[PDB]
């Protein structure tokens, strides 16, 4: 879409309806008359447009009203309310803008933010921007967390997030106009290459993929229609369902062969019975001809009974020749009706061994998308975030994604090498205790009104804890942390002195030999200006590969590549790197998924803040003190940069509302 | 509402391939055997039928009686009336057979015959003796 309705869409909002969040701060308007609602919506959209059209410079209340018309610039408490909401919740003026009104001189309130991932950074920026005292505590010696970027000479490749997944409604779209990331589109086309080292040919390539697709829908039908979601108490996984479907596909193939031969026999046996009749007639005939012959040989003159005998037997014989002629008739029909059936058999197999193997690559691809074994994904929910995909072609951040965390970090109080060990929070505030990662006996204490926790779910998951909560997190939250899934996926970075692959091809698959290893180096990316190839490790394979030496990995890696391109077009690599996200103690994995037995709803639990008990008993109910952002906290955009970025904006909003108070709600 | 095209999936069938740990591979074996045990039954009866055909070799060619082409006359020669009376004794009411035997009387002349000579060839008796067989 476009106009002002484009802005609504490009901001993830329905252009012609008020959202639940708007109903919350404008209950006057939404419970009001339809006429006022349209004015509101218009104002909203028009403001958005304005910001969007030009997100390199702040958009002030003035500059806004400045650009409106009657009947809209009519009411200015309204205009001011609207602008102020949009600002608070980071719909407008988020990211890196040029400020018009240099920063309000003294600050109010103090917030500790754990971790300077994008979620953390994005939140900090907002809070500082709202004039609050912000400090971030990073365990690593750099910003950006799971946005990591390998750099050396002219070599530049991300070991973490790497793709912008469409600009159509993507906060990141805005960010890229504020920050020169080099966005290059990805051509979808992915030639697969069997174990041997040769292309799967268009014929097959297409049949398998297409079967894969049908197999998926199948699970979906299985879930929603047949309601196959519990199986002896345990939630059914996607993996399970996929088998149960393949099983049934195999079955019906057999079922079909069975009733096809079942049809042959019933017919090839009507035929027997007819041939039996036919012999026995040829029998009576043989003997009747004899009888007639012997009656003809009585030379005449004969008396009439002997004349009748000749005649009788003659008719009697033509009668039985009529029959054995109609039966030879019938016989001919049933005999062709049987080269018929026997010439067009049903199919021999559901899928061959070469097939099942290629289908496995498609499964690996999916295990990659979800950073996890399909046997862990939830059936009912694995794709719950499906509706909220952006539109537009996927892109690569050609100059390395790190360029974004770094841009965001600028201006901010970030203590690097500072490992939080304890969060304690009480009716009157919070202290956070961290240490120095370099000499770990050397201790730090941070006092604050609020703590925003952006620790990766993998971290939050650790047994036993890497971070202590004082007091312990309420069980409703810890169950959420258990129930949810936190998967893994790894990269191999291959740096060469020359291109030896197809320059115009962005990705190309390698087909493994087994189910057990579909994930292993199953896919390669040609993305960058420099001659670099990237290789994925997904599925069950990812976890196991982390215990293998780098050399051995680059081994199997070159192996495959020679296999596909020629054992002497493939040199030694000038520089190599291998990720190990499950090992990395400040990640403990790669991103989250909807595990079997979870749902999108757990994600909402993750985001719900924590309010301490009262100090003196019978003292009033306190303010909430402990807040959460992170890719694991945003139901509609899990596992992504934009999704984290968004959770950051979210929390900053909710924190300011609480601590600086909301002037706009009236 | 319905499965994808050419994917097959009965409620009943699902409950079948799940009801225990190996109900999966159990059931694809009952079919793998039910199949081979028919492919065999086929050959058994293809063999039976192949031999029963080698008996029918030669057709009925050495037994076939040349074409008789003769003009349906209307006179009852004494010879013909006699053929008649005996064809009745042997064939009953089958007027076609009688007509065939006599050679040159159509299926109706035959019926008419039954009525004219009814008195004098005791066709009552003759018919009632044909029944007693
Ligand atoms: C791993 C990964 C890879 C390899 C790739 C990718 C990814 C991943 N994705 C995702 C993203 O990246 C994420 O989500 C984000 O980044 C997240 O963020 P946050 O939430 O912020 O978190 P972080 O970053 O982790 O941060 C945090 C922080 O904190 C700290 N700590 C810890 N602990 C502690 C601390 N501190 C203190 N103390 C203590 N104790 C740490 O260190 C940190 O810093 C993605 N996304 C997007 O968007 N894109 C892309 O591309 C990506 N990638 C993906 C996957 C998916 O599926 C892809 C690939 C290819 C294609 C497509 C996609």
Overview of the molecule:
The complex is a heterodimer of chains A (666) and B (133). Helix content of chain A is 42%, strand content 14%. With 666 residues, chain A is an alpha+beta fold. With 133 residues, chain B is mainly α. Chain B has a single domain, classed as Methane Monooxygenase Hydroxylase, Chain G, domain 1. Chain B is built from six helices and no strands. Chains A and B meet through helix 9, helix 10, helix 11 and helix 12 of A and helix 1, helix 2, helix 3 and helix 4 of B. The complex binds a molecule of 2 linked components (FAD-3PL). A molecule of 2 linked components (FAD-3PL) binds next to helix 7, strand 11 and helix 20 of chain A. The site of a molecule of 2 linked components (FAD-3PL) has 41 residues of chain A, from helix 7, strand 11 and helix 20. Chain A: It is an enzyme of class 1 (oxidoreductase). Chain A: Belongs to the flavin monoamine oxidase family. Chain A: Its cofactor is FAD. Chain A: One of its GO terms (molecular function) is protein demethylase activity.
Key traits:
heterodimer, A: 666 residues, alpha+beta, Helix Hairpins, five-stranded parallel sheet, five-stranded antiparallel sheet, 23 strands, 14% strand, elongated, B: 133 residues, Methane Monooxygenase Hydroxylase, Chain G, domain 1, 6 helices, 62% helix, binds a molecule of 2 linked components (FAD-3PL), REST corepressor 1 (chain B)
Rg of chain B, please? 33 Å
- Please give the alpha-carbon distance between the first and last residues of chain B: 69 Å
Structural class of chain A: alpha+beta
Estimate the strand proportion of chain A.
5-15%
- In DSSP terms (H or I, runs of 4 or more residues), the helix count of chain A works out at 20
Strand proportion of chain B, as a percent range, falls in under 5%
Order of strands in the sheet with most strands of chain A = 10-2-1-14-23
Catalogue the ligands. a molecule of 2 linked components (FAD-3PL)
Order of SSEs of chain B = HHHHHH
PDB class: transcription
Keywords: amine oxidase, chromatin regulator, histone inhibitor binding, methylation, nucleosome core, oxidoreductase, oxidoreductase-repressor complex, chromatin remodelling, transcription
Assembly: dimeric
Entry title: Crystal structure of LSD1-CoREST in complex with (+)-trans-2- phenylcyclopropyl-1-amine
